[PDB]
Design a protein around this ligand. Structure first.
Ligand SMILES: CCCCCCCCC/C=C/CCCCCC(=O)OC[C@@H](O)CO
Ligand SMILES: CCCCCCCCC/C=C/CCCCCC(=O)OC[C@@H](O)CO
Ligand SMILES: CCCCCCCCC/C=C/CCCCCC(=O)OC[C@@H](O)CO
Ligand SMILES: CCCCCCCCC/C=C/CCCCCC(=O)OC[C@@H](O)CO
Ligand SMILES: CCCCCCCCC/C=C/CCCCCC(=O)OC[C@@H](O)CO
Ligand SMILES: CCCCCCCCC/C=C/CCCCCC(=O)OC[C@H](O)CO
Ligand SMILES: CCCCCCCCC/C=C/CCCCCC(=O)OC[C@H](O)CO
Ligand SMILES: CCCCCCCCC/C=C\CCCCCC(=O)OC[C@@H](O)CO
Ligand SMILES: CCCCCCCCC/C=C\CCCCCC(=O)OC[C@@H](O)CO
Ligand SMILES: CCCCCCCCC/C=C\CCCCCC(=O)OC[C@@H](O)CO
Ligand SMILES: CCCCCCCCC/C=C\CCCCCC(=O)OC[C@@H](O)CO
Ligand SMILES: [Ca+2]
Ligand code: NA
Length: 459
């Protein structure tokens, strides 16, 4: 069930001979996930700077081990990558002692788990570097060192945990991103299925930085923090089979509203002879708000379509209304109603919900467990046209006073195999075409793309 070590993986594949493939089989003690990935990307800086283009291939091997003894269990998954350039073989990868190598080894997960606090198999406590994920992917979808308690039953779901990055556990990245250094996350949620297939819930997340900012006069480089924060996200979420590709209902929906409160100390800098020097810091409250809404029409067993709107506040008095996400999110979810997860704000733009408004349209198709396809359109705007947006897959400056971020068309197409009841492999095309709007200004490329083919096999 939900405690299975691959439960959260987007692939949704089942190895031949596993207990999940046939319940008469014993749980596997080991396996191998093999991934071959090609990536073409051009041009992430919209032509404004040298580099930013990829046309490259790689292999990513992920052996894993699992043991189970009464209420105790334990899991390890390693990772070895070899590629022709530094492509993305991992949708959850650290965004980048921060220069990745073409080839590297990593310890992806390593945890121990105790399920004995209660008799519910959906209840367990997990300690170590582990996959944390909730269904929207907008709060947590990452591998991180954590102590996390899960409780999943028919009428009640709840979770609580703490997490913090201490290393990347990678042979090529020796340092943490500044945003992660000394940042502790505590989180939890409670929800209930108040009617068959409809859930309502509350969610909380708190991030606290124990690190310090550079002092005035000190040089500032890319490994220093830009701010320290104490931030709390408090949300309400309602869903009707939002992320369930097997739904029986004719309509599926999601609605969430999140209030971000707390305080940030923002480092100030100036440039002095081509160098960046700290000049001080300024504190201020944050009082910001995010919303994501979606409606999906299940037209028949195979065809679906829908619409989405999301907005993360921006700007405001001393920047207090600048919404931002936890930093643990992927923003990838099954929001098109298929077995494949899709980036909620574009495979190319990869928007974070921060000073950003997005309108989305999608269609999808699927056949049994054998195929799926999704076509997604997005239009993006800034909320406050004198404030930055958050992270994105585009490295180009925004022009003050322009709200038109751009538009994007994405296509995902997947074949599952090894008709197959429980597939053990897949081949997927995932592409996004991004058309920058007026916020990107003159001299930028008219279009940009990011496209992948992935072949994944689980043994
Ligand atoms: C060399 C990398 C570290 C050792 C990992 C080797 C894992 C191989 C395990 C796979 C076995 C499953 C074979 C099909 C049943
Ligand atoms: C404590 C904080 C970090 C978590 C530590 C987790 C380390 C776990 C790495 C282990 C991988 C899974 C299997 C190890 C034990 C397997 C074992 O000998 O089981 C006995 C038998 O059932 C099969 O060999
Ligand atoms: C090993 C480190 C532990 C850190 C966390 C401390 C745990 C303290 C005890 C927690 C208990 C949580 C269970 C509460 C809910 C139980 C429940 O609703 O019913 C359980 C019962 O009906 C079935 O056996
Ligand atoms: C070199 C950095 C430290 C290595 C040890 C990592 C420990 C991983 C297991 C920790 C789990 C709970 C962390 C919550 C804070
Ligand atoms: C229902 C089963 C799913 C069917 C899947 C069909 C796959 C279609 C794949 C198509 C890929 C390439 C599409 C053309 C690219 C056009 C393009 O880049 O235009 C750029 C230009 O318009 C910008 O001004
Ligand atoms: C259902 C069909 C959907 C897509 C159909 C159109 C064709 C898709 C072509 C694939 C594009 C992904 C781009 C990355 C592929 C890997 C790549 O560029 O390899 C470069 C080399 O092999 C290394 O030099
Ligand atoms: C700009 C986008 C277009 C406008 C969209 C407007 C959408 C309005 C937002 C939807 C509100 C969600 C209502 C909650 C759903 C669950 C509900 O109604 O009650 C849950 C239970 O009854 C609790 O027992
Ligand atoms: C343009 C983008 C916005 C479109 C989506 C807006 C709507 C999002 C969904 C939110 C609320 C819909 C109302 C919930 C209805 C479900 C419900 O209460 O069912 C009642 C119960 O009897 C079910 O069996
Ligand atoms: C279920 C039957 C098949 C799916 C039904 C339609 C859903 C798929 C359509 C999605 C994306 C394709 C591109 C749409 C272009 C949108 C566009 O240009 O919007 C107008 C533009 O002025 C900006 O608002
Ligand atoms: C089948 C279609 C159903 C879904 C319709 C789309 C979803 C709701 C659209 C409503 C509002 C979102 C658009 C906000 C636009 C704000 C805006 O353009 O501000 C900046 C403006 O100066 C243009 O650059
Ligand atoms: C019904 C299908 C609609 C087609 C439009 C989908 C847009 C998202 C996909 C993005 C880009 C094109 C995908 C096909 C392969 C692209 C590719 O290999 O580009 C090579 C690159 O060197 C282009 O110069
Ligand atoms: Ca470039
Ligand atoms: Na339990």
């Amino acid at each position: 069930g939900s405690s299975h070590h691959h439960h959260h993986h987007s692939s949704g594949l089942v190895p031949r001979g596993s207990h999940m493939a046939n319940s008469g089989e014993a749980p596997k003690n080991f396996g191998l996930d093999v991934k071959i990935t090609g990536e073409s990307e051009n041009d992430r800086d919209l032509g404004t700077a040298p580099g930013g283009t990829l046309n490259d291939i790689g292999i990513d091997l992920r052996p894993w081990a699992f043991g189970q003894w009464g209420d105790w269990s334990a899991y390890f998954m390693g990772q070895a990558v070899a590629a022709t350039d530094t492509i993305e073989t991992d949708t959850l990868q650290s965004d980048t002692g921060r220069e990745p190598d073409k080839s590297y080894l990593a310890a992806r997960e390593f945890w121990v788990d105790y399920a004995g606090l209660t008799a519910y198999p959906g209840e367990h406590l997990r300690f170590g570097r582990q996959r944390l994920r909730e269904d929207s992917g907008q709060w947590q979808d990452t591998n991180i060192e954590a102590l996390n308690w899960s409780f999943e039953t028919t009428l009640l779901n709840a979770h609580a945990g703490v997490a913090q990055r201490f290393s990347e556990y990678r042979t090529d990245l020796d340092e943490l991103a500044p945003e992660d250094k000394d940042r502790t996350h505590v989180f939890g949620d409670i929800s209930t299925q108040w009617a068959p297939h409809h859930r309502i819930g509350v969610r909380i997340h708190h991030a606290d930085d124990s690190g310090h900012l550079r002092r005035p006069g000190e040089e500032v480089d890319n490994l220093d923090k830009t701010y320290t924060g104490q931030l709390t996200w408090l949300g309400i979420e309602a869903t009707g089979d939002a992320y369930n590709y097997r739904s029986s209902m004719p309509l599926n929906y999601w609605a969430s509203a999140t209030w971000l409160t707390g305080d940030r100390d923002n480092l100030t800098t100036t440039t002095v002879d081509d160098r960046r020097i700290a000049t001080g810091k300024q504190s201020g409250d944050v009082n910001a708000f995010g919303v994501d809404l979606g409606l999906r029409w299940n037209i028949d067993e195979q065809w679906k379509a829908g619409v989405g709107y999301a907005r993360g506040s921006g700007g405001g008095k001393d920047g207090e209304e600048q919404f931002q996400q936890t930093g643990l999110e992927s923003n990838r979810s099954n929001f098109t109603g298929t077995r494949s997860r899709v980036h909620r704000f574009g495979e190319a733009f990869r928007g974070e919900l921060s000073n950003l408004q997005a309108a989305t349209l999608f269609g999808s198709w699927q056949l049994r467990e054998d195929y799926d396809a999704s076509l997604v359109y997005h239009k993006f705007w800034r909320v406050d046209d004198d404030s930055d947006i958050g992270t994105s897959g585009i490295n180009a400056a925004l022009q003050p006073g322009e709200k038109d971020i751009g538009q994007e068309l994405d296509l995902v197409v997947t074949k599952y195999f090894k008709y197959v009841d429980e597939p053990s492999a897949l081949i997927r095309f995932r592409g996004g075409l991004f058309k920058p709007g007026d916020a990107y200004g003159p001299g930028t490329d008219s279009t940009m793309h990011r496209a992948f083919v992935d072949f994944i096999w689980r043994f």
